Amino acid sequence: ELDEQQRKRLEAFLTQKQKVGELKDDDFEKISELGAGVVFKVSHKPSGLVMARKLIHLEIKPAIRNQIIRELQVLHECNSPYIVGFYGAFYSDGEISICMEHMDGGSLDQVLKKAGRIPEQILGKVSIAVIKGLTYLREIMHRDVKPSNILVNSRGEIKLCDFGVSGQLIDSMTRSYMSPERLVQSDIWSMGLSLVEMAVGRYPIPPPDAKELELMFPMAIFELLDYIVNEPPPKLPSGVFSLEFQDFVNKCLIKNPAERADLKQLMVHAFIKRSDAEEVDFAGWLCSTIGL
Ligand SMILES: CCNC(=O)C#Cc1ccc2c(c1)NC(=O)/C2=C(\Nc1ccc(CN(C)C)cc1)c1ccccc1
Ligand SMILES: [Ca+2]
């Protein structure tokens, strides 16, 4: 479902997008550098709009990059309040561009790094969008839900950015959020692994013993991937998070993908019903958290 706010914004996005024409390299002025995704906050000179320009260095033939572009045209169709807006994609001087909606809060990975750890009420709302994002995508499949893959903003929006719509792009160019069975329900797992990472403020594999957990409130890359498979999943610490929340992530982080909760089930899980109901000023927290 969409509100008459979420609908109005999508009309305001499209109309401001219909004004923007065919994207060319020369029509962009660099404002600043956002970070490695390398993404620039740009200004589309003729339209006067502000965008996020991802630039991928790729040594490939014409017939290759022309495919990549054709596959990214599919992102014009895919419009949702839980998916980051798309303006276009092209190739120029030895690099493919992807011109997209500028989310002035940056990634949850960034917000975590400055927040410390994210509050439950807040992670309530993050969970709701990430589900509706995945539920929109379903109603093509997704590629890996990280906190670096979730963008947020001062309006109070929470959107999935960078799912995989182009195969050859993935080809031509971490694995620590993958579900064991990948070594559809993998998406839910990652949301479970992520929410925990943000709730406690640290990557939860391996788990912190009572030494850190008491105070709060390294493994080599391939050594980890084993532990993920052969040992039990991470869980929120008890006593500091509500049990409704503890159950949610538990039902997400089940190793056996069948016994793991699906999208339809999570969407009506007590945690969601509680949060959706809650009246939380997300845009306050964020803006005050990261100083805007
Ligand atoms: C082809 C399919 N689509 C994609 O591949 C894509 C994408 C994409 C990727 C990143 C961004 C985006 C879109 N829009 C944005 O605003 C992004 C970022 N904004 C952003 C960062 C920091 C501050 C402020 N900081 C510095 C405090 C503000 C804003 C961002 C950039 C680098 C790393 C993390 C996030
Ligand atoms: Ca250029």
Ligand SMILES: [Ca+2]
């Ligand atoms: Ca140029």
Ligand SMILES: [Ca+2]
């Ligand atoms: Ca020129």
